[PDB]
Design a protein around this ligand. Sequence first.
Ligand SMILES: [Zn+2]
Lengths: 157, 416, 210, 35, 464
Amino acid sequence: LIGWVPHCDTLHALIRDYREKKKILLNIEHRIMLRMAPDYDHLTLMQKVEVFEHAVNNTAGDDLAKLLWLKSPSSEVWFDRRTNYTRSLAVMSMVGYILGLGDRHPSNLMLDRLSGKILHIDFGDCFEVAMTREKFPEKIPFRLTRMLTNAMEVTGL
Amino acid sequence: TKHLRVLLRANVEFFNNWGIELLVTQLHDKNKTISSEALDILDEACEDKANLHALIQMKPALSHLGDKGLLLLLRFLSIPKGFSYLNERGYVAKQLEKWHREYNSKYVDLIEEQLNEALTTYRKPQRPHVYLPIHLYGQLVHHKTGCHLLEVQNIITELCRNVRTPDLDKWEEIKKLKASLWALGNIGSSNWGLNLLQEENVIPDILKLAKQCEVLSIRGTCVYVLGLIAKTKQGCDILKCHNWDAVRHSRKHLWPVVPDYIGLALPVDINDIFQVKDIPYFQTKSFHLLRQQMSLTEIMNTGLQEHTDDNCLYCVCIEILGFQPSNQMCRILLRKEVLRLVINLSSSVSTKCHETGLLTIKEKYPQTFDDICLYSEVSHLLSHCTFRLPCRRFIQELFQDVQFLQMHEEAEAVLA
Amino acid sequence: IYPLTVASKSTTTARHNAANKILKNMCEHSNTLVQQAMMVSEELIRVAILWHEMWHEGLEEASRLYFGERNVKGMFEVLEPLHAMMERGPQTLKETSFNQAYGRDLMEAQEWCRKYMKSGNVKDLTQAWDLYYHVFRRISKQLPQLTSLELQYVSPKLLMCRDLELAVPGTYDPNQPIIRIQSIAPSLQVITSKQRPRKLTLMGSNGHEF
Amino acid sequence: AFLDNPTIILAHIRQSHVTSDDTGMCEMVLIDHDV
Amino acid sequence: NVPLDLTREPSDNLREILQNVARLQGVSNMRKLGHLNNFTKLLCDIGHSEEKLGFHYEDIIICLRLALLNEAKEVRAAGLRALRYLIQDSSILQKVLKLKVDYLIARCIDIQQSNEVERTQALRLVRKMITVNASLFPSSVTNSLIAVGNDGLQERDRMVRACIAIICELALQNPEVVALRGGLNTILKNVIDCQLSRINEALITTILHLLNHPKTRQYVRADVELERILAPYTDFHYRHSPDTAEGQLKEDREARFLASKMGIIATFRSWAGIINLCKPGNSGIQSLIGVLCIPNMEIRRGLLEVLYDIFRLPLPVVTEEFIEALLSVDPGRFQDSWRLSDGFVAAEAKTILPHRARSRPDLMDNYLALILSAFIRNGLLEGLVEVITNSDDHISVRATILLGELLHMANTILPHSHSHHLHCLPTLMNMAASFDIPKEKRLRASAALNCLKRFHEMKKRGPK
Ligand SMILES: [Zn+2]
């Protein structure tokens, strides 16, 4: 029996609503990679970098940055929420690294609407289990992508 | 003819002197349907005493008609004036003999036919009304003179012993039990019919049979016959002692007031009839293993398991007919591979994989499906196991283009 | 109270006996509290997974073991608890409804598995899987349609409480006045997902919905 | 109803199928001659 | 073919039985087709015997056995026809079963090669085998009949109803073989998807017959065989066919309800079904009444139509006002048989003027009194009150009329003891005179009593 946390929505659904409103396909980046190389899943390590790097260059990742501003009633509230978001994601990144959390896909990442905090759910893979699996072993301590790092502040991370 | 019914239900003045006489002339009409319709509306009019006396004084001839005419004629025995007229040419004695041998049991058929037409969608070649047909024993007990004949013949003892000792094994002797229950119920429909019926203590026997009976049809039959017993005030008192209630008002007034009765009776607790004793269910009383670790080609680099000399098309004729023994390691490993795919096809878990495996064998080795013994083994397995229709049609179809020369050679020799 | 009920419901005999011994001691000073917790715990777990939910997971797991691992003794032990609950009789309309639609197939398939334990013929076990797989296909076609549940249909004992002395789960501190369960909403919504979680809304003693 | 004895049940089965079948098969397969 | 009919019987016997094998050479299939017809004609003249018809019975079967393996459908059809005229007694039939001919008889049942004329001949032979001796029916033929009936609808098989009619006949004379092969489950699943009134009545009658005699109830389970027909109404999400097209999914539910409704009605008109569905323990009737109280709109509208047909009451029109629905139930409503072209007065006067019978027992009222008593015992009246005060506007009106009909039926058919506490309605009356409950629920109950009272006046007036 898991408690229900109010005023929070998952990151995957948050981006989906923004893109569909702006007449933007949900998987533009995925389509470009398949168009350039249909056998993306079978490419070698060096070849996947070329396809992956090409996709992120032809599409500008700022959906989360603009999303947090359009939902702010004023500029004073916008700055307060952004500050909380930046220093709440950093806490879970280091704590999650020690615990060894894995499988941090966007569906398991929730952002608080009223305060801008970051909440993590589904603590299933711990103690580096996901890194040692033979099926798609992820090799990243935590989730820090271009979408998140473009919303904390303009100067970077 | 159909318009004489509305003049009957509207209580037209003096209908019993000019209306009844018009239904006797119409009874001899040329068309059967018109004559049959006249009997239907005439039986309804006979329920009034004034109308019934009119027919007796006219003494019509109803013997030439069918069973409808015979039943209408039997109602004359309920009146002492009509009983003397009939019991003067030697008629009641003939009916008693005929009502014990020939169609005593056919009265049950008349009961069942009306119910089956009412609500079954059977139609033997909107709420209807099903009224109890006229019965000889139920009309002879209205007057004491008629009741005397029923007792001297000693028919009550014959019927009562059939109820206390029922044989619920043969479907023909069960109908005799029904032929007795419906006969006992009509006798108890009158006060003078209950005096000679309760002296042998038969009513509790029916009550026991109405709640503890192996055959459920007999259990439901007793409910109807217990209604006929409750047609009198005296009869309802007997049932009340045994925790059976009944309605104590007639149908002439549709708003009864608690201070002739219609036949209806139900137990105080309805669950006393719906109890049935439980009866236990009757069901309560190799190459396959080695194949999964190897391949068909790897192993290559008697086979029939359930093959005995009683369930084979060719092997069974060695002794009875006189056939010759069949003739033939490469081919013995193909029988097991074919057989094991048949068993795995009985689960339908992976039909495509198993069907693909059998098609390849028929292409690479088309001659393996040409032995009668293998077909007998497959046919035997199709009986014990269960297969889906598309899968069952897939088997027995790879064997369409076969010759079976062994059977042809042997059959020709023994026949010639 | 909550951890003890979980321990008392464990499969292990040692944990089961030890947990019950502690429970009966608490019955002296507070008997009505443990009785309510046992009723609530049994009903909540019943709502979480229904009879057709258990069989869908059980048959899918059993099929993988038999056809992937080729283990026969391990397949039966998976399905033994599933057939065990059907012998105790349905306690609600939903369980009664399941026992009519798929009751005959599941009970007959058990009989064929019983003959394999004695005869040992492979055909008996294969014929048993003809009924298990047929029911599995039927259940899999109605799982997506399940989108809402009525308390009367699944567990009538939950909406007839109207009052409880048991605290709301997940909120209890000795330094704060306690809040108890007042009522349970008569309808709960099922979230469309692979696990299909339910949305249970309680009612606190102070008028705050949890 | 009193559909108890097999005599009337057999008649009912072979009458309903013949009368109420769209396909002309029961009229040819349920011939009373074969008894 | 030239029928000789001149030489001796053994001489005439040799020719056709020699050309039937032919070693698949030197003889055409056309000649074999004509030779088989000669055997049937010859068998009509000389009676069935082993002393006059040349060889013994066993030799004739062997040569006749090599006629069903031909690749021509006409020859196989003729070969099956000859066997029908040959099997007359159990001695001949047992000799045929000894040679395992059933492996070939069942083969011709399911080949589906545009041989509908051949398949009719095979099925007609099966009915001959059952009549001669039903206790020795082979299990190979039985399993073929179950397969073509259990899964004969998805394959668009046209001879599907002709095979179910044979299983039911076999299930009455040898239930043991049918029970083992799961033949009783096939009949139960057929009534779910058979929306023909006459056929559905016949199928359910056969199963109820097995529950009648004490020595046959051992072949039917307790609470899972007969209660299968209640699944469409008891289960809100019922899937009868694991594989079906999703295009007619909405239509499939409507077909299931209509077919299941004719099954529940059919089992409540037989004594073998009333008792089994109303056992003192857990029964199907309690589940059927219990599901009525659940606030579901699709089930409730379906169940009310069932209840009207069980008691054989006229269905009102769909509306949201009681007055419009009340005018459609009056016995004096106009009918199409009352015109001048049809019965002018005699047809009309039958349903208005009352019958001249005050003492003749009515066997139909006895049936309804027992049925009504069973539902009241299980709690039908309490269920209807919940439906009236907790449903949609157009559903409560249908339930109010049904409640009014039962009360009027119960004060003239049921005995006093059953109905002395029936007209008070303790549950409905307390929801009326209660100011603690929400006002919307209170006035729905109060309005129900006013509407129900006006129904009483309609019966008081009578037909006009
Ligand atoms: Zn052999």
